[PDB]
Enzyme design. Structure first.
Site, PDB file in Angstrom:
ATOM      1  N   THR A  20       0.828  -1.236   0.000  1.00 12.72           N
ATOM      2  CA  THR A  20       0.000   0.000   0.000  1.00 12.72           C
ATOM      3  C   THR A  20       0.853   1.272   0.000  1.00 12.72           C
ATOM      4  O   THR A  20       0.471   2.304  -0.563  1.00 12.72           O
ATOM      5  CB  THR A  20      -0.942  -0.034   1.232  1.00 12.72           C
ATOM      6  N   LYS A  53       2.108 -11.429   7.827  1.00 13.53           N
ATOM      7  CA  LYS A  53       0.956 -10.842   7.195  1.00 13.53           C
ATOM      8  C   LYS A  53       0.645 -11.730   5.963  1.00 13.53           C
ATOM      9  O   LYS A  53       1.469 -11.888   5.043  1.00 13.53           O
ATOM     10  CB  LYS A  53       1.263  -9.416   6.781  1.00 13.53           C
TER      11      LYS A  53
END
Ligand code: NA
Lengths: 293, 293, 293, 293
Positions: A43, A154
């Site tokens: 991101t 993650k």
């Protein structure tokens, strides 16, 4: 469980990191209850940053908080080693790396050796950034256990069975999902949280979904989760990585500049159409006193 | 048709480009009949190189030959523009770029805008480096026609229908396959040749497959193509990009230094095992009078 | 090499096999130079046919020609055995089976056992019908070699390297492509031909492509292949298996009744759009004298 | 939430349905707390059954319970309509269909027509059996909304985002996961339960995972879910659909005869090795008093 923001990297008009806008965004996220910030993730356009820029990003966020996971990976292992070692001077939570991206058909041994190399020089706990679609390879619960030095993972994947397997095979590992759509679920099912792109622009929503699920108000958690899903879907219309900038401005009220081409900024008409898709959602969140206005 | 080598980048023990080994390799390839050299492709670990190293590669190769297609792509568009403009002082065949890699779900519009931007600044013909498995994108014959500015394409894909489609929708475009296993087929079917990783280490073989196929000795071309396939399969046991270095030294008699980790060098045992897997093939090539000994 | 039509099954208004229409169709194909007819393939909706209907299809086509490959496979091995045994009374080219379809993650051992069983009871040469997209599993060149009893394979896949690998590992096998888009290519590259759905409605074209490539008129072969490709693409717009009926009527002038739901016939609007997409091709083909009119 | 068993079809030595063994198995599942029985699903080898046999299954199970979802789909829409109609005389929970399988690239329009046709004739609620890997297509929450006549869905997919979407887009829809590895997670996150193959052999386990998760004992639910996962994994070594037979006999103490080839029975040695893999788990389940000795 936690909401972790893989924070956006604001670029200036002339394609440099805007440190100042980055600090304002970081401050707001921490003030809004975000647990930790994941720096140079997808991101944040990590793969579009030089190693020098990945450092600059860390330095600017570090001005705001110690609560940072510092992503350092790339296709020059010496640069990634160097970033890992330089993180010794930062009192952060951990460093991280995605797997070597682009090159197909990379052997398991070479993948394992890349990560073991970084664990060997790391002055901090190491987190696995697993993203099979982006990187072209999967570092699954079994490979993670073989590598043996991850403090957490993650897992950006649409397969929660795969995410749960990390926990099954590595009981002490912190196990996060990379999806915004699974915040309610992850908190209901015994996982450790979400590194959620959408917490950039709606940190209040992501935190509240989590809180509701924790309190076992699953039908309320799902109702809010489903609203959040609509914004995620809207964000994908013109491309999420570009749209995240527009949405953060719209919902949080400060500018985050531009993404880095070829992640191109939205144009005026795209921006207008995107806002059209989420304005009724914004009203409703204001109505619900989740968003202040 | 042509054989084009996506030439290996040799690194020194301390991870810098070994210019002198690069020149010796480039010079051998041209002397063995290779048509052009593709600089900073996958085989050359282009995605692992900085913009400065990509330029350094061009310069060293340019000392040997001007028959160069210069790959400039990356995730910072300004850097790729810079490389394209800097190529103006080199009398080369063209520049090339793969699609922006890593990020999933990039819009067609953004992908088109990336290449058209590079077309607008290019002082040479522009070649499309299509590699859907590596980059996560396909820029197909329809999208290539939209973009409208490609003189040629390297289609790294096993689906030859896809590669033929570039020709069908773009009759003036030069159309190459990136497969070593399709050299006989590409030559027989009216396409322009192959950008073949295996031509680094067996350029004599790839040129002879092409020549036999042109002569319509299809069965002789295939027998040779099939032996070459076995070498490609051997190279994949320990990882082709690493193995390419060992196979070059073995078959051509000079070394190409080290790859760049996380493309790790084979160890002594892996090298021994790979050599065992291709020894009998070398014997066959010697009896066919393709190789000396 | 050969062109083999996987012949359409025409169904009557009460959803039975229209034997009279099938016979007219089979007679036309043979008259226009089609080498052999593949009965009960995907194109003939084999998986939609009961064992009794698969046998009815064979008997009708057998009234016209013995140049038949008789597909018999399905998820009840006893039925496939019975069909395989029944074919002893028919002087035909071979039997064939696709792999057991639908069920994911069947063991290699079970897949091999299914085929060897059919081989043990077969009174004719046995052809592998390989269609990984449709069946959910691949029976590649190595598994074919391990099975050891195939006279030939039809490889319906978008990967000619995969198709060539049958010839490489099994040099005495007949190796066909299932693609209409690869007639020119297969003929030029030493493969044995194409089991081409589009030869149902443009048998003139598929045979002329193969003839031109055999004469080493590659450019002319490709020009015609590329027009044929356009018809294949149009047939796919509304669903190829349904569109194959409309196209047969359009180009050959007799109809083939209806498909079997859920392979639904095109409606009127769909037919009009489809015909608008092919009528300019249909005029180019009459001009070239490939079609009468 | 509920556990629904996609019940195994026992076959006799000569490949007929063993109605009496089926009745024994159904009664046991109901008595051990399974909520409903999904008849003719994948696990029952529904695609392997003629329409007549799918009817025999219903009649056999119906002699034990009316808590039945009756799967009636196939590639002959006339037969599925007939089955749907014939269910009028059975006081059951619902009928169901998977999408038409095998044929790739069926238009959404045709897929919608197939299911709407079955809804229009059905005398019971209709359930969507979604299984993209087996059928080759996805009838997602949006398409299910379009079709607009489903009472519930079984989503056999590993992506729980996709499963949650049915509830998000179709609030009144009953939404089940087809995964055994998601029992704890489905119960925790507000979905309706699991159509779980492995509840055939370990109904006690699957009902207990659910119950623990319902009581918000997520820790304990996961521990037991993780054990169950290890049984699912063991069953996949020689093929789950064959292995499920062996595991039912092992855990429940009565046999279910044979599967239907090409779903071949495990051999004596495969059976011994499989039991070896699950012996240790059976022991734990006894200590935990989930199973009797
Ligand atoms: Na067919």
């Amino acid at each position: 469980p936690e909401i972790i923001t893989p924070i956006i990297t604001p670029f200036t008009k002339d394609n440099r990191i805007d440190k100042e806008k980055l600090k304002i965004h970081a401050e707001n996220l921490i003030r809004k209850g975000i647990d930790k910030l994941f720096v140079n993730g997808t991101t944040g356009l990590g793969p579009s940053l030089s190693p020098e820029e990945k450092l600059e990003n860390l330095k600017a966020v570090y001005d705001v908080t110690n609560k940072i996971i510092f992503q350092v990976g790339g296709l020059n292992l010496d640069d990634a080693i160097r970033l890992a070692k330089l993180s010794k001077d930062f009192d952060i939570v951990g460093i991280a790396s995605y797997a070597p991206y682009y090159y197909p058909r990379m052997s398991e041994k070479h993948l394992v050796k890349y990560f073991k190399t970084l664990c060997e020089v790391s002055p901090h706990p190491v987190y696995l950034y697993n993203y099979p679609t982006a990187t072209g390879k999967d570092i699954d619960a079994k490979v993670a256990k073989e590598i043996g030095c991850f403090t957490g993972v993650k897992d950006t994947i649409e397969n929660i069975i795969h995410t749960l397997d990390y926990k099954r095979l590595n009981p002490n590992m912190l196990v996060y999902s990379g999806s915004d759509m699974l915040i309610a679920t992850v908190a209901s099912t015994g996982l450790d949280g979400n590194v959620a792109a959408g917490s950039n622009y709606l940190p209040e929503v992501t935190v509240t979904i989590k809180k509701l699920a924790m309190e076992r108000k699953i039908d309320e958690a799902l109702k809010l989760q489903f609203l959040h899903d609509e914004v995620i879907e809207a964000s994908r219309i013109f491309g999420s990585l570009s749209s995240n900038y527009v949405l953060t401005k719209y919902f949080q009220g400060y500018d985050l500049g531009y993404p880095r081409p070829p992640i191109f900024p939205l144009d005026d008409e795209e921006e207008r159409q995107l806002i059209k898709k989420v304005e009724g959602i914004r009203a409703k969140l204001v109505e619900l006193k989740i968003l202040k206005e």
